Every structure is written in C-alpha cells, then in structure tokens.
Amino acid sequence: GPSVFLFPPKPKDTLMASRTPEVTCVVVDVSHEDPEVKFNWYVDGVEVHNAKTKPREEQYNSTYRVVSVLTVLAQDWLNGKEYKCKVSNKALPAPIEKTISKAKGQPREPQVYTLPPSRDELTKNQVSLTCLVKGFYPSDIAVEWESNGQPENNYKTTPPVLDSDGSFFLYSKLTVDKSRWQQGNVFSCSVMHEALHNHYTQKSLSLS
Amino acid sequence: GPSVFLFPPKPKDTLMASRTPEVTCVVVDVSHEDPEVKFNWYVDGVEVHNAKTKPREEQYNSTYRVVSVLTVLAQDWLNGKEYKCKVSNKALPAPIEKTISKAKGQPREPQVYTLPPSRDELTKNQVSLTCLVKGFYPSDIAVEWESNGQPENNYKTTPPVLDSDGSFFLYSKLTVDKSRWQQGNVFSCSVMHEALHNHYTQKSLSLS
Ligand SMILES: *[C@H]1O[C@H](CO[C@@H]2O[C@@H](C)[C@@H](O)[C@@H](O)[C@@H]2O)[C@@H](O[C@@H]2O[C@H](CO)[C@@H](O[C@@H]3O[C@H](CO[C@H]4O[C@H](CO)[C@@H](O)[C@H](O)[C@@H]4O[C@@H]4O[C@H](CO)[C@@H](O)[C@H](O)[C@H]4NC(C)=O)[C@@H](O)[C@H](O[C@H]4O[C@H](CO)[C@@H](O)[C@H](O)[C@@H]4O[C@@H]4O[C@H](CO)[C@@H](O)[C@H](O)[C@H]4NC(C)=O)[C@@H]3O)[C@H](O)[C@H]2NC(C)=O)[C@H](O)[C@H]1NC(C)=O
Ligand SMILES: *[C@@H]1O[C@H](CO[C@@H]2O[C@@H](C)[C@@H](O)[C@@H](O)[C@@H]2O)[C@@H](O)[C@H](O)[C@H]1NC(C)=O
C-alpha cells in the first residue's frame, strides 16, 4: 500500500540555543476507506507520546498525506538518540518502522578558510568570495555569509562532500559587485557545527 | 511490479574524441514467473536496432536486476536527441517508455579560476588547492587535476550547483604535501565541457 519517509531536524535547529528542532514523519499514498493512520513515536526504543500529528491532508492525488512531527531536544539529537516512527494502517499487513538518528562516528572540527577572488576574475563586474570548510564529521552543518553585522543575499553553498579521509568538506560561494570588494569591505563566513566551540565560528575576508 | 531507471552517458564520453558514450536502461525488482524482459530502443522516435541488452544479473534481496546498454553517437547526444528505452515484462499491465535527453537550453562557457590555499592553512602539513569552475550550462562536465603530465590522486570535486542566474558552478579540491607547494611545482585544473574550444581548457596554479 502506502510509503513512508522520515526527516531529520535541520542542522541549525539542533545547534543553536532557543530553537525548535523536530524530526518529521511523513506518509504518502494512503487508502481512502482506510484513512485511520496511527503513529507511534519511540526514543531509543522508549515510546514518547509528546508528539503532534497535524491533521490528515486531502491531496489532489485522492490520497491523504498525513504528517506527524516530534519536537525533540537538541541535546537528544546530538547525544544520538534513535527516533523511530511506527505507522499503522489497514492497507498494511504489518506496520512501517523507519528509524533515524544523527550519523554515528567521531565528530570532527571543521577547518574554515576564506579565499578571495582570482586575480583573473577582476576583469568582471562581480567577484567571487570563497569559503572552504573541511575535515568535519558528521555532515550536518550550516554556513552563512554576512558583512558588517548584516546578512548577504547572493551566496550558494555546495552540499557536503565525502573527502578521502572519511571527513566532509564543502565550499560556499559569495558573490559581490567588484566595487564592494575593492572598497576594502569586510565579509564574514559563518559556520555552525557540533564540534565547534559554542557551535559557532566565523572568518573575515578582506582585501589588503 | 517492476521499476525502471534510465541513465545518461558520462560527460567525458561525449566530449572527448575516441570515447564510447552509452545510455543505460536498468530494470529492477524483476521476478521469476514472467522474467523474460524485452527492450525496444527508439531514438528521437525513429527506432534503433544497434542496441545491446548485455546478459542477466541476479541480486541480493531476492529481487532482480536487468541492464541493457545502447552505445550512442556522442555528437548525437550533444545535438539534443531523445533516447527512449522501451521495456516489455509480463508482470507489467503495459510496457514502459522512459525517456532521457541532454538538458535543453543555450550551452554556456565555464569560467575557471584556480585559488591558492589560505595563508592560515600553511600552518598545516598538507594544503588545499582550489579550482572554481562557474557559469557553465548544462551541468554535464568533467574536472581533473595534474602536474608534469601525470594526473593527481588526492582530489575530490563537488557536484554542479545551480547558481542564482540559472548557471552551474562547482569546486574541486586538490590536496598535496605542503612541501610540494613550497618547491613551487605547477598544478593544473583541467575542465572538459561542451561549450569550450575543443571541449577542453586548463588553468595553472603556482606559488607567488
Ligand atoms: C533490492 O536491492 C536492489 C539494489 O539496490 C540496493 O542494494 C542493496 C545492496 C542496498 O544498498 C539497498 O539499499 C538497495 O536495495 C534494489 O534496486 C534498487 O532500486 C531502487 C529503486 O527501486 C534504486 O533507487 C534509485 O536509484 C537511481 C539511480 O541509480 C544509480 O545510482 C545509484 C545511486 O544513486 C546506484 O546505486 C545505482 O547502481 C545506479 O548507478 C548508476 O547507473 C548508471 C548506469 O549503470 C551509471 O552509469 C552511473 O554511474 C550510476 N550512478 C551511480 C553509481 O551513482 C535514482 O535515479 C532513483 O531516484 C529517482 O527515482 C526515484 C523514484 O524511485 C525518486 O524518488 C528520486 O527522486 C529520483 O527521481 C528522479 O529524479 C530525477 C532528477 O534527478 C528526474 O529526472 C526523474 O524524473 C525522477 N525519476 C523518477 C521518479 O522516475 C533511485 O534513487 C536503486 O538504485 C537500485 N539499486 C541498485 C544499486 O541498482 C531493489 O529494488 C531492492 N528491492 C527492493 C526491496 O525494493
Ligand atoms: C500523490 O499526491 C500526493 C500529494 O502531492 C500534492 O498533491 C499533488 C497532486 C500535487 O499538487 C503536489 O505538488 C502536492 O505536493 C503526493 O504526496 C504523493 O506522492 C502522490 N503519489 C504519487 C507517488 O504519485
């Protein structure tokens, strides 16, 4: 019958003080004469009832896409609790159990390095500011760019990539009008990861 | 029933002269009561019988895995031709016609900028050499690193990322012993893409 998917909390949610991290159990392609879907939430094999499965949603598929959401404690996500989602139905000869948890493995402090635009790139109106983040484990992480306290718009970050030593790296590309980098403006690559002091580091990036 | 997955050729196989590009039809979850699988490859509608359904392979989870492979003209792919794989199983209520082609749109030339390690990283044993390749379209691309005619081993490349303007970028990180970067060796990032002159370009990178 149906098919189930289970989502981790966002990295920023598990690593920053007053946020609301939450793993999300999502059901697709249910029945119709059997819309009664039960969820059962277990933390490390212990059932918690502190959930809230927001109402069924009639889709144009003629399926009810139901969604449950467990607000989890950020220290729980980090200390590596397994969140198991049991989903019951009539279309199920047996329920569905999907389990999720932070990657297990020894965490690794990311190295953060800011790279200025290529000398070749100066013949362009816009320049590329680069942020290199390597040797982190596990892959969960967040990178933002700002200048003078205020955030920056025009950046994109590659996904984490498994490096040769079993750690991850990524790059973040920030784009600015050459004029801005020229004036001597300062920009900042911010990074959030668990193996960081206060879960937070940052690196400025300026011309000479 | 069974599912199907169609795959494009490898970028370098459609970009470099004497290579042999192939699209590949992979059928999975095949049974045993009606396990005869027939393929009827069509190219841009007008059928092709230059195909090959290389022999039947088993699988772990008691399921099955049947893979055909059409060798294809490289320039044909670049022109934009549609490649149709047509499967015929009996556990099917109907044959499948999954389609694949190159990304439509105006091919754009990649920009290639090499980037020396951050001064901060010179206090490490190994250093990171960085190749920023941006503004290309479509995403199909190949990147390689080398020095003195020999290739380099220790490198990794992020997947193409969609940029704010509809173009792709990526980075490639080459990792070497610091000592080799102090000698002032020359290192090169090579990029193969359909929009370049001879589908090829390369960028030096060396110590100041
Ligand atoms: C029993 O086992 C087998 C074996 O699989 C595994 O084996 C064991 C050992 C364990 O690892 C198990 O986890 C697992 O069972 C099962 O066979 C599997 O079948 C599933 C689906 O039923 C497949 O998932 C899909 O994978 C394809 C991509 O496949 C390539 O890449 C894989 C990794 O990404 C790689 O493992 C494969 O071998 C394969 O390799 C590529 O093949 C070409 C040609 O050979 C090669 O040249 C490439 O280099 C190579 N690439 C590599 C190596 O990475 C993926 O496309 C599927 O995702 C699409 O479809 C989904 C719908 O199911 C959808 O959810 C996704 O979002 C995505 O949708 C597509 O999105 C694109 C945009 O990107 C869009 O254009 C399309 O329209 C859209 N397609 C749709 C929706 O139609 C999906 O991830 C497994 O690959 C396959 N395993 C292998 C290894 O063959 C078997 O089914 C199992 N039985 C059971 C229990 O069901
Ligand atoms: C059926 O549709 C379900 C809900 O998707 C939503 O409604 C469809 C019609 C679109 O409007 C879509 O953009 C919405 O998100 C899906 O969750 C479900 O997977 C679909 N079933 C399948 C597998 O086709």
UniProtKB/Swiss-Prot annotation, chains A, B:
GO molecular function: antigen binding; Fc-gamma receptor I complex binding; immunoglobulin receptor binding
Chain positions covered by the region annotation CH3: 105-208
Gene name linked to the record: IGHG1
Annotated protein name in UniProt: Immunoglobulin heavy constant gamma 1
Cysteine pairings via disulfide bonds: 25-85, 131-189
Domain Ig-like: 2-101, 110-206
GO biological process, one term: complement-dependent cytotoxicity
Cellular component, GO, one term: extracellular space
Keywords, in A-Z order: Adaptive immunity, Cell membrane, Chromosomal rearrangement, Disulfide bond, Glycoprotein, Immunity, Immunoglobulin, Immunoglobulin domain, Membrane, Secreted, Transmembrane, Transmembrane helix
Clinical note on disease: Multiple myeloma: A malignant tumor of plasma cells usually arising in the bone marrow and characterized by diffuse involvement of the skeletal system, hyperglobulinemia, Bence-Jones proteinuria and anemia. Complications of multiple myeloma are bone pain, hypercalcemia, renal failure and spinal cord compression. The aberrant antibodies that are produced lead to impaired humoral immunity and patients have a high prevalence of infection. Amyloidosis may develop in some patients.
Chain positions covered by the region annotation CH2: 1-104
Native species: Homo sapiens (Human)
Effect in UniProt of substituting residue 1 to A: Reduces the affinity for FCGR1A about 40-fold. Abolishes binding to FCGR2A and FCGR3A. Impairs ADCC of virus-infected cells by monocytes. Decreases binding to complement component C1q. Decreases complement-dependent cytotoxicity
Sites carrying sugar chains: 61
SUBUNIT field: Immunoglobulins are composed of two identical heavy chains and two identical light chains; disulfide-linked. Interacts with FCGR1A; this interaction mediates IgG effector functions on monocytes. Interacts with FCGR2A and FCGR3A.
Processing and modification events after translation: Glycosylation on Asn-61 is required for interaction with Fc receptors and ability to activate the complement pathway.
Biological function: Constant region of immunoglobulin heavy chains. Immunoglobulins, also known as antibodies, are membrane-bound or secreted glycoproteins produced by B lymphocytes. In the recognition phase of humoral immunity, the membrane-bound immunoglobulins serve as receptors which, upon binding of a specific antigen, trigger the clonal expansion and differentiation of B lymphocytes into immunoglobulins-secreting plasma cells. Secreted immunoglobulins mediate the effector phase of humoral immunity, which results in the elimination of bound antigens.
Species lineage: Eukaryota, Metazoa, Chordata, Craniata, Vertebrata
Range of the intact protein held here: 120 to 327 of 399
